[PDB]
């Protein structure tokens with residue numbers, strides 16, 4: 001019993017964190033095999049950030065301008081290349097702690113663990129989600145650039161995010177491990193703001209099914225809804241549209257609890273209308289949207305209370 | 306910017322998790338040097354005469370895909386210590402520490418000696434933890450990291466009827482009035498950790514959330530009278546002293562913030578949130594707030 005925001009064990013990622021220095025800038029890098037991956041803005045000054053020509057800045061650098069530190073050991077850079085917004089530094093030593101890994105690009109609503117680092121040293125681990133507006137609500141200070149997001153289903157680490165910047169509202173923007181940004185964001189200090197955010201509907205539904213599995217049903221009602229009528233109501237509360245894919249994905253939780261997806265949608269419509277009235281759901285007074293259907297099946301028991 | 310429930314990096318603890326099987330029971334063990342520590346209920350009462358029947362070869366210890374040979378066994382309170390033939394080469398610098406209610410720690414939840422998740426939690430004033438555990442999680446451990454030294458503070462033993470959890474320090478002494486056996490036992494009425502809510506209000510101010518600040522101040526005595534009525538723990542002068550750094554950083558005296566807490570308790574939040582929460586959060590200590598709003602590394 002119990003339901004917590006749970007992150008993956010971070011050990012396989014800790015053994016990959018290194019410090020990357022270029023002139024006055026110091027940030028974090030991900031050391032996998034003989035390559036160190038880091039944000040390309042490590043080559044910029046604060047002035048360069050308004051309109052950086054990364055290609056012009058990189059061509060002026062040589063291998064020995066990049067200082068890479070792994071623990072108390074200096075690594076030797078023997079090559080360098082840019083791939084989108086990531087810099088790939090070829091080093092002379094392969095990381096003996098390299099785990100089994102993949103680079104995966106995620107979709108909004110997907111969750112992942114973040115290992116927040118400063119000076120190539122891990123300081124904390126937390127769980128978060130890719131928001132529908134492509135930002136993440138993280139906890140990052142200056143020096144955290146290069147910190148990574150990952151999932152560890154089985155013993156394979158799937159790297160999905162690398163931290164690049166903080167937007168004016170305090171939210172964060174970054175790239176997949178191939179250097180492609182999530183969202184319309186650029187690694188430029190330009191006037192850019194996160195779009196209006198929405199609630200991840202399929203995740204709130206999954207979390208309501210987790211509450212039913214843990215023995216709570218106070219929020220259920222005798223009604224059902226069509227998918228269209230649910231979306232017409234949900235859009236009015238800034239909830240993401242629920243698609244037929246979302247309904248199919250919730251199938252296993254629906255069969256386990258005995259409650260149809262469209263009946264759970266009717267409870268959601270009612271919670272949005274009435275609020276919680278002094279009650280909580282899994283120790284929360286708000287509707288939680290940072291647990292996917294997959295996270296709920298992984299964390300919760302296979303036997304409903 | 307941002308404020309998350311953050312756990313310590315779990316790697317130094319992952320390298321210590323093993324699976325212990327004895328009879329039909331399988332649970333987790335902590336392998337440090339040549340000793341495996343696990344809940345004594347794995348032998349399952351009078352544990353000493355139940356233990357005397359067992360031989361070293363009855364305890365099956367598995368570290369990854371490698372079998373560890375048990376060469377000795379002894380009990381210390383509610384923990385079983387299995388002497389093994391091999392010292393753990395991944396043993397970190399460590400201490401066994403007993404924590405107080407209100408203190409926080411990270412839990413590495415494991416099943417079959419394999420870590421599956423890490424989360425942050427607090428020792429409740431009623432000595433239970435609101436964790437997330439299924440059958441097979443027994444032996445999972447709680448810890449803090451103070452530089453490069455892991456301080457082990459908790460070992461999971463059982464789930465109570467309300468879904469909350471009970472366990473021991475690494476010397477086998479339970480937190481709370483619990484016993485390791487199937488009997489009628491329940492968690493006492495819980496209270497809110499006042500010094501932790503105050504720390505979290507200071508974190509909200511640091512992150513630019515000031516709607517709850519007011520011009521008023523209060524006395525420690527008047528605040529405690531009010532707090533006792535909302536099932537909040539008494540605030541002591543030690544708590545006030547501990548909040549000193551956050552008081553100087555934000556410019557809000559601890560009794561000035563206590564008056565904000567008083568108004569929140571009597572009026573509610575009125576449709577507003579603080580750090581994305583509609584409830585007053587009590588699982589961040591003053592040190593957690595200073596650490597997360599400063600970037601301390603391990």
Ligand SMILES: CCN(C)S(=O)(=O)N1Cc2ccc(Cl)cc2[C@H](C(=O)Nc2cncc3ccccc23)C1
Nearest residue numbers: 041049140141142144145164165166187188189306
């Ligand atoms: C607050 C962000 N700035 C305006 S900044 O510090 O001047 N700035 C501009 C900037 C622009 C583009 C890119 Cl790709 C990176 C950056 C840098 C940046 O975003 N780094 C930070 C990252 N994460 C959390 C951060 C919290 C605090 C400070 C800095 C953080 C550096």
Ligand SMILES: CCN(C)S(=O)(=O)N1Cc2ccc(Cl)cc2[C@H](C(=O)Nc2cncc3ccccc23)C1
Nearest residue numbers: 001346438439440442443462463464484485486487
């Ligand atoms: C619900 C607890 N039971 C009644 S039990 O499963 O029959 N039971 C009895 C019992 C008695 C004493 C002691 Cl020290 C341990 C236990 C066991 C126990 O607490 N294990 C569990 C631990 N954590 C989460 C658990 C979730 C689900 C089940 C079991 C969990 C095992």
Ligand SMILES: [Cl-]
Nearest residue numbers: 105106107110
């Ligand atoms: Cl995805």
